[PDB]
Symmetry: C2
Subunit: 118 residues, 2 copies
Amino acid sequence: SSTHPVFHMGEFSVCDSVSVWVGDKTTATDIKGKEVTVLAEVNINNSVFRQYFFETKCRASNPVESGCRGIDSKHWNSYCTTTHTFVKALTTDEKQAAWRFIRIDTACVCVLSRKATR
Amino acid sequence: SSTHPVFHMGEFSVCDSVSVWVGDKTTATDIKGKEVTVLAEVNINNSVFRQYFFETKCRASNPVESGCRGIDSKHWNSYCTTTHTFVKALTTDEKQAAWRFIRIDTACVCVLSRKATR
């Protein structure tokens, strides 16, 4: 059936990623390597904001049984790597809410390798 | 010459992306569609933090003259789309610094299309 305009003449990617705005994140690692308790809402003094985090995870580490879709999996070995970044969030290491930079999954990238070790 | 272990037996992606931590971002659009002046440092009351933004842009919209590297550009048409996300930043719409959600470039994804219009 030709009743499919490729979703939206595109949109599909080499790998399937899922981006979720997580607020129920209770723990995250700061850039300094500190595992801290993350707050769903930022309580500064008299202001509460729902911050949330856009965590883009890999739905599949290998959309196809060889690597990524479209990729010549004979010369190129592929896998979906979830990239971690450090985001400015109000987090508490114990009983002190402070603005830190915590690692969240920002994207899911398909990496290519020539599958040739040296 | 075989003096190349594929950089790090991988790392290379279908598309070339550049992730920069920008602090000199003076303007950004809030999720509500408000063009606001972005501050390099967040001045709340008596606390100044250097926030910065991780903007991952596309170094090339088409790494190869057909689509993306490895992709069968005969059945799949490809191009690198820079994904925009809204990040919680202290921004001023004029003379009021407030925590808003501004669109930054978070990733550069290679999208695939069957190059077949319906």
